Amino acid sequence: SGAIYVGNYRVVNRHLATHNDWANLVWEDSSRDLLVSSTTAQGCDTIARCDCQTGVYYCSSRRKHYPVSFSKPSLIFVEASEYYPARYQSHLMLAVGHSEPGDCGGILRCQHGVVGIVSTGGNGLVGFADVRDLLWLDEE
């Protein structure tokens, strides 16, 4: 579990969004596993606006932050699960690391700010849904 809080926005994995998120919806994209809802109070996370390929992510299943190298956001095949059929997920970045069910929502950060959140796992890999292209998160 986990979310990004920027301005009056809450960014969460679409497959983990609560009833309250759907009742206060801003934007969602199933192909990216992202959902953004509106918040009453201002958030303080800064979104990275960069092309960094090294950062640090939080892994709840180990209670540890790990330094990782990760790929550029790409269309990657993700195996069928209880939340989606087998499909290509867009804007996804992979790293070698631990990720189990329960780790989605962990933040990946570089020197510029938040890069994205854990969205996939297994086979000794961890996948992060990028948010650096969502420039509107910084305004209105």
Ligand X SMILES: CSC[C@@H]1C[C@@H]1C(=O)N1CCC[C@H](C(N)=O)C1
| Residues noted as catalytic | 15, 33, 104
Residue 108 binds to Zn ion (criterion: CB under 5 A): no
- Using the structure block, give the residue that is written with the tokens 């892994």: 59
Give the residue, chosen from 21, 103, 105, 137, that forms a contact with ligand X under the rule CB under 6 A. 103
Which one of ligand X, Zn ion, none is in contact with 114 (Cβ closer than 5 to 8 A by kind)?
none
Q: Name residue 93's beta-bridge partners.
A: 128
Binding piece for Zn ion, criterion CB under 5 A, among 59-67, 87-95, 107-115, 121-129 = 107-115
Nearest-approach distance from CB 53 to Zn ion, in angstroms:
9
Binding piece for ligand X, criterion CB under 6 A, among 3-11, 21-29, 98-106, 130-138 = 98-106
- Using the structure block, give the residue that is written with the tokens 């959902």: 35
Residues in region 58-87 near ligand X by CB under 6 A = 78, 81, 83-84
Task: CB nearer to ligand X: give 113 or 116.
Answer: 116
Half-sphere exposure of 25 (CA within 13 A, CB side): 11
Residue 27 φ/ψ, nearest 5 degrees: -160, 145
Q: Distance between CA 14 and CA 18 in Å, rounded?
A: 9
Measure Cα distances from 2 to 18, 116, 120, 121 in Å. 12, 11, 14, 15
Task: CB nearer to Zn ion: give 56 or 125.
Answer: 56
